[PDB]
């Protein structure tokens, strides 16, 4: 069984953590903002998926870059019901895709909060994120991460995961050795300039 690594990105309040709970069937959990790291393992088909749940607030989202070398793909979540933020999300997503370690990796976009009256169609999200000129394979799934109490989770959550897995899968041959390598590189520089920082208060 292959292991792949996925990052949950997208602005704060988009619904990353909630979607992560729902897709596991953990329905009655409520959520607080995320300001750090949180690993979670899922299974889809013949793949075992480790999911980094990260914060997207202004004061923590600059941390994303620290993880990108270790990932095969991104789940990018957008509050489709908050078009006032599409532009911010667009910049933010563009900046991720322009990262060296993001080449050739697919993005699964969730147009979340389709329950809300202001939910923009999956179509307007496309234009809003400038996906036509994007340089990565992508797909968009409208969804409702927070279904009402006593109702099944949105099946479009696993549909999107399935597509992302399928896409990583079709390219697993060149992508995975690339990720194992590049994650090792980043890991060892972060260690070495820690070693410098560490025994540079040997100072006594």
């Amino acid at each position: 069984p292959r292991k792949i690594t996925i990052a949950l990105l997208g602005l704060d309040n988009a619904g990353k953590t909630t979607l992560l709970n729902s897709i596991q069937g953990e329905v009655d959990r409520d959520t607080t903002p995320t300001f750090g790291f949180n690993s979670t393992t899922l299974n889809e088909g013949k793949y075992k998926i480790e999911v980094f749940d990260l914060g997207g607030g202004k004061n923590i989202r600059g941390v994303w870059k620290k993880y990108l070398a270790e990932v095969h793909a991104i789940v990018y979540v957008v509050d489709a019901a908050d078009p006032g933020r599409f532009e911010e999300s667009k910049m933010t997503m563009a900046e991720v895709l322009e990262n060296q370690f993001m080449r050739d990796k697919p993005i699964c976009i969730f147009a979340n909060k389709q329950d809300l009256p202001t939910a923009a169609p999956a179509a307007e999200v496309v234009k809003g994120l400038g996906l036509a000129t994007c340089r990565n394979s992508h797909n968009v799934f409208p969804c409702t991460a927070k279904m009402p109490a006593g109702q099944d989770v949105d099946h479009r959550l696993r549909d999107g995961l399935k597509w992302l897995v399928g896409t990583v899968d079709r390219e697993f041959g060149r992508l995975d050795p690339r990720v194992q390598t590049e994650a090792e590189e980043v890991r060892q520089e972060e260690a070495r300039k820690k070693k410098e920082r560490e025994e540079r208060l040997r100072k006594q």
Partner: protein, 164 residues
Amino acid sequence: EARILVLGLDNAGKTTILKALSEEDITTITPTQGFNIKSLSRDGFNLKIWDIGGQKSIRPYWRNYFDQTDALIYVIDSADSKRLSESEFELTELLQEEKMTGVPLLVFANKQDLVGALAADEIASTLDLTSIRDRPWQIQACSAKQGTGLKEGMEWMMKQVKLE
């Protein structure tokens, strides 16, 4: 009952936080010696906290209070420049500790009310938090002096505790 460990460099603001969460007066606070028990009732749990000093001579005695720890709260002076690296080394030593395995980490980035106070994301980098893979962690910017951030930090912590 949850066994909650609260550590950090001396002057980081451990006691001031603990007292603020306890609805007590913080106007005159003293550096801490010995091992003072604090009992917080929160979400139908009873939190057993040792309030401990973070002076260099006290730190080796930290090791004696690690057992069946349900959560680790770590306090940083966000506005104290030169001591940032010293704080990192001590937290690193803690996360290497065996009885800390899989223990949720809450970092209180304290004294956000001070000019020069680092933001969550730079603290996360200077403390090498972004290298962690084996535990869940929050960095919660806060000001014990002004009573901001504390309830939010504990809210996350209590979620991780009640999950287990």
